[PDB]
Design a protein around this nucleic acid. Structure first.
Ligand SMILES: [K+]
Ligand SMILES: [K+]
Ligand SMILES: [K+]
Ligand SMILES: [K+]
Ligand SMILES: [K+]
Ligand SMILES: [K+]
Ligand SMILES: [K+]
Ligand SMILES: [K+]
Ligand SMILES: [K+]
Ligand SMILES: [K+]
Ligand SMILES: [Mg+2]
Ligand SMILES: [Mg+2]
Ligand SMILES: [Mg+2]
Ligand SMILES: [Mg+2]
Ligand SMILES: [Mg+2]
Ligand SMILES: [Mg+2]
Ligand SMILES: [Mg+2]
Ligand SMILES: [Mg+2]
Ligand SMILES: [Mg+2]
Ligand SMILES: [Mg+2]
Ligand SMILES: [Mg+2]
Ligand SMILES: [Mg+2]
Ligand SMILES: [Mg+2]
Ligand SMILES: [Mg+2]
Ligand SMILES: [Mg+2]
Ligand SMILES: [Mg+2]
Ligand SMILES: [Mg+2]
Ligand SMILES: [Mg+2]
Ligand SMILES: [Mg+2]
Ligand SMILES: [Mg+2]
Ligand SMILES: [Mg+2]
Ligand SMILES: [Mg+2]
Ligand SMILES: [Mg+2]
Ligand SMILES: [Mg+2]
Ligand SMILES: [Mg+2]
Ligand SMILES: [Mg+2]
Ligand SMILES: [Mg+2]
Ligand SMILES: [Mg+2]
Ligand SMILES: [Mg+2]
Ligand SMILES: [Mg+2]
Ligand SMILES: [Mg+2]
Ligand SMILES: [Mg+2]
Ligand SMILES: [Mg+2]
Ligand SMILES: [Mg+2]
Ligand SMILES: [Mg+2]
Ligand SMILES: [Mg+2]
Ligand SMILES: [Mg+2]
Ligand SMILES: [Mg+2]
Ligand SMILES: [Mg+2]
Ligand SMILES: [Mg+2]
Ligand SMILES: [Mg+2]
Ligand SMILES: [Mg+2]
Ligand SMILES: [Mg+2]
Ligand SMILES: [Mg+2]
Ligand SMILES: [Mg+2]
Ligand SMILES: [Mg+2]
Ligand SMILES: [Mg+2]
Ligand SMILES: [Mg+2]
Ligand SMILES: [Mg+2]
Ligand SMILES: [Mg+2]
Ligand SMILES: [Mg+2]
Ligand SMILES: [Mg+2]
Ligand SMILES: [Mg+2]
Ligand SMILES: [Mg+2]
Ligand SMILES: [Mg+2]
Ligand SMILES: [Mg+2]
Ligand SMILES: [Mg+2]
Ligand SMILES: [Mg+2]
Ligand SMILES: [Mg+2]
Ligand SMILES: [Mg+2]
Ligand SMILES: [Mg+2]
Ligand SMILES: [Mg+2]
Ligand SMILES: [Mg+2]
Ligand SMILES: [Mg+2]
Ligand SMILES: [Mg+2]
Ligand SMILES: [Mg+2]
Ligand SMILES: [Mg+2]
Ligand SMILES: [Mg+2]
Ligand SMILES: [Mg+2]
Ligand SMILES: [Mg+2]
Ligand SMILES: [Mg+2]
Ligand SMILES: [Mg+2]
Ligand SMILES: [Mg+2]
Ligand SMILES: [Mg+2]
Ligand SMILES: [Mg+2]
Ligand SMILES: [Mg+2]
Ligand SMILES: [Mg+2]
Ligand SMILES: [Mg+2]
Ligand SMILES: [Mg+2]
Ligand SMILES: [Mg+2]
Ligand SMILES: [Mg+2]
Ligand SMILES: [Mg+2]
Ligand SMILES: [Mg+2]
Ligand SMILES: [Mg+2]
Ligand SMILES: [Mg+2]
Ligand SMILES: [Mg+2]
Ligand SMILES: [Mg+2]
Ligand SMILES: [Mg+2]
Ligand SMILES: [Mg+2]
Ligand SMILES: [Mg+2]
Ligand SMILES: [Mg+2]
Ligand SMILES: [Zn+2]
Lengths: 99, 99, 83, 124, 208, 138
RNA sequence: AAAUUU
RNA sequence: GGCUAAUCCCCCAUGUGGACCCGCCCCUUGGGGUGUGUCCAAAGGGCUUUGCCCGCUUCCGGAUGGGCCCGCGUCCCAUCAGCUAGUUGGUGGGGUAAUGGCCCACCAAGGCGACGACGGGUAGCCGGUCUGAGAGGAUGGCCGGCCACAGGGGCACUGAGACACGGGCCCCACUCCUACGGGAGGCAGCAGUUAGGAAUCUUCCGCAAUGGGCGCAAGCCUGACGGAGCGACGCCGCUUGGAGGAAGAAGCCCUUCGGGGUGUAAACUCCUGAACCCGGGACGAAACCCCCGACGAGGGGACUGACGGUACCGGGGUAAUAGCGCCGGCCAACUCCGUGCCAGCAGCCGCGGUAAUACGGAGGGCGCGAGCGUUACCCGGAUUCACUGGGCGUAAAGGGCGUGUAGGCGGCCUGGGGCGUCCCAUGUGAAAGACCACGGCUCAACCGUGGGGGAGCGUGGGAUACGCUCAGGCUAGACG
């Protein structure tokens, strides 16, 4: 006895599963990278931070991880990685971090 | 323009924070008498530069914390503990009227 | 978007419109940004339509969108005339 | 008082206590009678006044006066009361509105009819 | 309502000869010529010294019943005059004299103000060409009050404008008798009106 | 001490004129003297002058009265019929130029203290400045 | 004892 | 479980540019620029079809709308005097578009309060409105602005934007379906029902006008809205006739029995023609669209009326609703009879117990009049909470007295500052309302246009008499 705008509801559900997915990846990868920065493995840490930044920006392409919240995540990630590598040194792969 | 007040530091007991008491005179809305009201503002001192009794200027700032919305612009004049003593006496008088 | 439209201000059976710039989301008789003219549909007075031309050109330059009726009234007032 | 006292204490606005606690600020209130008695007036006068203790829909149960020459108000009579007091009757602060739900208008009334609920008489 | 009823009883009660019937208030039949005392059973009895409120109320009632205007429009006109700049009394009199029915009466189109009210209400009067049927219409300086061309053949207008030959009109009015029209030249001054009313008493009456 | 020296001077003048004295001594001060200048300029007094009492300087105000009247109470008409202080300590009165009072519809004066000196109501209105409404005299 | 002071 | 399309999702590329770490420069909180490194783009469709239209992507800016923060203002109760544990601050994080103790760890012990915290009560706030000489008091309905809420409570998702009235989830109360396992619903949208109440409407017409959503457009949707209906609820306009008409019909009421009153009032005479009956008959509606031009400017063409055969105009044409309150004083209007402290009246003083201008009726009169009264409530009078504008010997009111804290108040002279105070310029003070002028509905109510305003606050500049502050001096107050 109701109106078909329930369609919207359905769509939202799909989009929900689409967003929750992407974020769930990003966070995970982030943790991984940070771990490799805490343990000193620099090449692997930066090689994974590159993919983390890529996923962040690609999620920013859509409505999942949109405007500068994505830059916030990228900034915090790169800052933490560069700081944890300075406790060990030797930024091997020379990826996202500038010289 | 960001509001600028002028007051007295009456509490340095906090970390990186001061309590600036600011007075103001104005005619009563109905009785015309020039009455004097006062208000305390929590101002930000990031260097612990200002101490008790210092008369300082205060500038409206981006919020530093709840209840803390002002920074200390400059030092108007050095410590004059007379106003701090007046405030402390006005506070201590509150213990005499309980029951 | 911001639109140029007509607001009803006359009494019952006595319509009087204000040619007005306002956000499309607000009600038609609500707080408008600026009154750029007025329009009397029944032609009661010799001046039943007045429009500020320079202001209309400004609001069109910044990106306002007039209604079909508002565009008709502005065209009758030579807002778009480039002769 | 000095201006300083006026700044400290300030003048005190006076509130008027309502003479008609017919609640909700209503102009009239409906009620059902309980007793229809006869009360004697105070010192300067002497008569037999017609009063009725009305139980109100406002939650109150107050005595109210029955104007007019004659009335027909039994125990279970439902009547509407209005403001206005009877001076020579201590405790009576409300009137009965004659012509409302049980209280017929005063019969053979010809001078002041609208005040006692009597309709205009017939042909001249 | 316009009070409709007996009129010369007001000629009696007000104590001053009023002209509410037009004629017959000039003839020895006004009942004010032969019965100057107020009406009622207690009209011939010795009057008591009236109060100040009595004097002011009777004066205002005289001024109002002269024009036959209801208390509503009367109070509205008084407040309107008091809002304006200038002497309240003279402006009030100029407003009352500006009423279309009173202008019709002053121009001699009707013998009485109530006959003028009936003439206006029935569309027999035009203003600047357009027919107007409102006694409360306000005439402005420069307006031409004319008789309807379709009504100029009626008997009453023939009689009234046949008696207006040779008669004079107010200083603030002009009259063309052949064309059956006239002009409202200006607002009348207090000196122009011969009303037996003290306007300051009415101002004080509404000052209460 | 005196809580309001200006009101004290005005009250001295009032009480002195009410008994038809010749002159009255008020403790000297530049403010009181600048007020007495306006008083003498407007004609409410015959004038003032600095004098010396036993050790301290004072101001002798020479009062002014009207002609002796007939009938009962031949005491002359007072030149200063009324003199009242307005901006008192504890409730000070400040007025803008458009808020200056017209005393007795022009027949009186209102002494103002403005940034351009001590003036009268018409003087301050002509200068176009307001200030502290010291007193009114008429 | 009440009302009315005429 | 299986098949499939895309402006659905994804990968790689192109890097105008942008995002991030780090360094440098300008700027000064996270603003702008630059270098290296890294990372990030896209979607097609329609034709009048190889040329345009609707789009798409990245970036800068505009405009609009909003989030957050701060100064000042915003009711009563002190028979509420102490309040506070995320409480106050810090560091580091999480979180958001963004600051923040918003949230979380660790550390410091703080934060607020008689200048009224905390607590209780009441209440959306304002533009305004009512009243008032003004100051002020009261109020926040219609319309306009902001807020909050959508049976009660809590929560997230989607999205530029929601913690989403006619979206979702859970708990609670209620109603309905039920195969008893489980489900459905949420008028404070329009109208309407019922309950409560002294009391508040039609289960109406329409997409024509204005506005809104989608669409290239045609067009679709719109209980927004435009109208009609009901209710003297208010405001305004209008009618129930106009003129002649007796020293004065009758009836009715008084009466000194002579007469007086109702009263030109009526009947009547003449005249106009509310109602109604016909005929014509709207403005509100010219754009979107099509054609020419160039899908531009410009020109031209066509369609479209709910109200409604309503308004309005012309002709014809009938004398054709008046009621309500009051008549002792305040307060304008007096007699008769009945009644006999009875029956009753009354806003206050008061009236009635035998001859009542006060009760009841009559005659007459006064006041308003399609209204008149009553009740309730607000302001007024009320200078009766007194800022303007009051008082305290005996009328209500000086504390039983002192010492003294905070606070309030501060002798004379000079100088600096310019916080109070004052002045000039400027910004703000939306519209409507209010005021003035003109104009549109035959007037008015109503409405349009134009004008004028205005306290307060921000900014720049100036003045320094007084109040303030700082520095110095004096001795008349004070103390010794
Ligand atoms: K304490
Ligand atoms: K680069
Ligand atoms: K902007
Ligand atoms: K919703
Ligand atoms: K005719
Ligand atoms: K065109
Ligand atoms: K006709
Ligand atoms: K009886
Ligand atoms: K009676
Ligand atoms: K005031
Ligand atoms: Mg849908
Ligand atoms: Mg859909
Ligand atoms: Mg995981
Ligand atoms: Mg989101
Ligand atoms: Mg200070
Ligand atoms: Mg400190
Ligand atoms: Mg902090
Ligand atoms: Mg909006
Ligand atoms: Mg034109
Ligand atoms: Mg153009
Ligand atoms: Mg019964
Ligand atoms: Mg006037
Ligand atoms: Mg006036
Ligand atoms: Mg000011
Ligand atoms: Mg004046
Ligand atoms: Mg002059
Ligand atoms: Mg008695
Ligand atoms: Mg499948
Ligand atoms: Mg298949
Ligand atoms: Mg896409
Ligand atoms: Mg580049
Ligand atoms: Mg790529
Ligand atoms: Mg692709
Ligand atoms: Mg092709
Ligand atoms: Mg499309
Ligand atoms: Mg903003
Ligand atoms: Mg908190
Ligand atoms: Mg923090
Ligand atoms: Mg969000
Ligand atoms: Mg607290
Ligand atoms: Mg405070
Ligand atoms: Mg509430
Ligand atoms: Mg007024
Ligand atoms: Mg007013
Ligand atoms: Mg006011
Ligand atoms: Mg309020
Ligand atoms: Mg509202
Ligand atoms: Mg509203
Ligand atoms: Mg409900
Ligand atoms: Mg809820
Ligand atoms: Mg719920
Ligand atoms: Mg969207
Ligand atoms: Mg909400
Ligand atoms: Mg919801
Ligand atoms: Mg609903
Ligand atoms: Mg459901
Ligand atoms: Mg009921
Ligand atoms: Mg309705
Ligand atoms: Mg329909
Ligand atoms: Mg439409
Ligand atoms: Mg449309
Ligand atoms: Mg409507
Ligand atoms: Mg009317
Ligand atoms: Mg007659
Ligand atoms: Mg005829
Ligand atoms: Mg047309
Ligand atoms: Mg073409
Ligand atoms: Mg065209
Ligand atoms: Mg259409
Ligand atoms: Mg039709
Ligand atoms: Mg006709
Ligand atoms: Mg009288
Ligand atoms: Mg009575
Ligand atoms: Mg009363
Ligand atoms: Mg008898
Ligand atoms: Mg009798
Ligand atoms: Mg009587
Ligand atoms: Mg009668
Ligand atoms: Mg009424
Ligand atoms: Mg009152
Ligand atoms: Mg008062
Ligand atoms: Mg007063
Ligand atoms: Mg009182
Ligand atoms: Mg006082
Ligand atoms: Mg008193
Ligand atoms: Mg006493
Ligand atoms: Mg004593
Ligand atoms: Mg002190
Ligand atoms: Mg002290
Ligand atoms: Mg001093
Ligand atoms: Mg001091
Ligand atoms: Mg100085
Ligand atoms: Mg200053
Ligand atoms: Mg305005
Ligand atoms: Mg206006
Ligand atoms: Mg007009
Ligand atoms: Mg101004
Ligand atoms: Mg300045
Ligand atoms: Mg200076
Ligand atoms: Mg000193
Ligand atoms: Mg001594
Ligand atoms: Zn007469």
């Amino acid at each position: 006895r109701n109106l078909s705008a329930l369609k919207r509801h359905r769509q939202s559900l799909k989009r929900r599963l689409r967003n929750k997915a992407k974020k769930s990846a990003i966070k995970t990868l982030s943790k991984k990278a940070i771990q490799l920065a805490q343990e000193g493995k620099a090449e692997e840490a930066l090689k994974i931070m590159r993919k983390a930044e890529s996923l962040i920006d690609k999620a920013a392409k859509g409505s999942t991880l949109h405007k500068n919240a994505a830059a916030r995540r990228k900034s915090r990630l790169m800052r933490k990685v560069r700081q944890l590598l300075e406790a060990a040194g030797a930024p091997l792969i020379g990826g996202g971090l500038s010289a | 323009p960001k509001k600028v007040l002028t007051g007295v530091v009456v509490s340095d007991k906090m970390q990186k924070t001061v309590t600036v008491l600011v007075e103001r005179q104005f005619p009563h809305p109905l009785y015309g008498k020039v009455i004097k009201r006062s208000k305390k503002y929590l101002a930000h001192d990031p260097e612990e530069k200002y101490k008790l009794g210092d008369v300082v200027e205060i500038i409206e700032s981006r919020p530093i914390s709840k209840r803390k919305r002002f920074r200390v612009l400059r030092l108007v004049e050095s410590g004059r503990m007379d106003l701090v003593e007046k405030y402390l006496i006005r506070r201590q008088n509150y213990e005499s009227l309980s029951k | 978007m911001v639109k140029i439209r007509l607001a009803r201000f006359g009494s019952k059976h006595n319509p009087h419109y204000r040619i007005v710039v306002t956000d499309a989301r607000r009600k038609r008789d609500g707080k408008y940004i600026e009154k750029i003219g007025y329009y009397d549909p029944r032609k009661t007075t010799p001046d039943w339509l007045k429009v500020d031309v320079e202001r209309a050109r400004y609001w069109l330059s910044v990106g306002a969108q007039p209604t079909d009726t508002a565009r008709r009234l502005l065209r009758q007032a030579g807002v778009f005339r480039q002769e | 008082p000095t201006i300083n006292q006026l700044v400290r204490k300030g003048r005190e606005k006076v509130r008027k206590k309502s003479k008609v606690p017919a609640l909700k600020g209503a102009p009239f209130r409906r009620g059902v009678c309980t007793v229809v008695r006869t009360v004697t007036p105070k010192k300067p006068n002497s008569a037999l006044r017609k009063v009725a203790k009305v139980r109100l829909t406002s939650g109150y149960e107050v005595t109210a006066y029955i104007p007019g020459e004659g009335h027909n108000l039994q125990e279970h009579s439902v009547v509407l009361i209005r403001g206005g007091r009877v001076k020579d009757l201590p405790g009576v602060r409300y009137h009965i509105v004659r012509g409302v739900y049980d209280a017929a208008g005063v019969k053979d009334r010809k001078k002041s009819r609208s005040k006692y609920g009597t309709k205009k008489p017939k042909e001249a | 309502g316009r009070y409709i009823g007996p009129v010369c009883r007001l000629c009696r009660r007000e104590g001053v000869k009023l002209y509410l019937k037009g004629e017959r208030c000039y003839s020895p039949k006004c009942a004010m010529e032969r019965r100057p005392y107020p009406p009622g059973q207690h009209g011939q009895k010795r009057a008591r010294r009236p109060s100040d409120y009595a004097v002011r109320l009777r004066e205002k009632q005289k001024l109002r019943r002269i024009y036959g205007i209801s208390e509503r429009q009367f109070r509205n006109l008084f407040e309107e005059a008091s809002k304006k700049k200038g002497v309240t009394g003279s402006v009030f009199l100029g407003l009352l004299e500006s009423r279309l029915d009173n202008v019709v009466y002053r121009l001699g189109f009707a013998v009485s103000r109530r006959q003028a009210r009936q003439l206006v209400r029935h569309g027999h009067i035009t203003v600047n060409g357009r027919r107007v049927d409102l006694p409360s219409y306000r005439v402005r300086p420069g307006d031409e009050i004319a008789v309807a061309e379709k009504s100029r053949n009626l008997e009453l207008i023939r009689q009234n404008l046949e008696a207006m030959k040779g008669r004079k009109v107010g200083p603030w009015l002009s009259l063309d008798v052949e064309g059956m029209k006239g002009k409202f030249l200006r607002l009348p001054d207090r000196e122009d009106l011969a009303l037996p009313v003290n306007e300051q008493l009415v101002i004080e009456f509404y000052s209460r | 001490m005196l809580t309001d020296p200006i009101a004290d001077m005005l009250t001295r003048i009032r009480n002195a004129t009410r008994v038809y004295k010749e002159s009255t001594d008020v403790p000297a001060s530049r403010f009181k003297e600048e007020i007495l200048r306006i008083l003498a300029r407007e004609g409410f007094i015959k004038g003032y002058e600095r004098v010396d009492v036993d050790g301290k300087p004072y101001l002798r105000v020479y009062l002014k009265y009207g002609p002796r009247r007939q009938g009962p109470d031949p005491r002359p008409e007072q030149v200063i019929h009324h003199i009242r202080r307005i901006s008192k300590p504890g409730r000070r009165v400040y007025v803008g130029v458009k808020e200056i009072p017209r005393v007795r519809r022009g027949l009186g004066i209102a002494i103002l203290s403005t940034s351009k000196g001590v003036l009268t109501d018409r003087e301050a209105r002509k200068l176009g400045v307001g200030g502290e409404l010291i007193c009114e005299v008429w």
